[PDB]
């Protein structure tokens, strides 16, 4: 989960990182977030608009759990 933690949250702090198009390929990482308790879905159809996004809350708890390290 260490790698996953930063995947969604990284983009809100530093754009493009792991959420923009990365979600479509590494959806399993983003799916872990359901266990952490916070996620948001844009369309999940393609990889451009159909991606997931993090909520403001997710960045605080999830990243501190050892995000990337």
Swiss-Prot record:
It is believed that a second protein is produced by a -1 frameshift during the translation of gene 5.5. This frameshift may occur anywhere within the region corresponding to residues 85-99 of the sequence shown. Thus a portion of these residues may be replaced by a portion of the segment GLFQTISCNSTGGVL in the actual gene 5.5-5.7 protein. Transmembrane segments: none annotated. This is Fusion protein 5.5/5.7. GO terms for biological process: viral translational frameshifting. Signal peptide: none annotated.
């Amino acid at each position: 989960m260490s790698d996953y933690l930063k995947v969604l949250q990284a983009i809100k702090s530093c754009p493009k990182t792991f959420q923009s198009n990365y979600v479509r390929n590494n959806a399993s990482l983003v799916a872990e977030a359901a266990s952490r308790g916070h996620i948001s879905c844009a369309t999940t159809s393609g990889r451009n608009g159909g991606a997931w996004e993090i909520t403001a809350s997710g960045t605080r708890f999830l990243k501190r759990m050892g995000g990337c390290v």
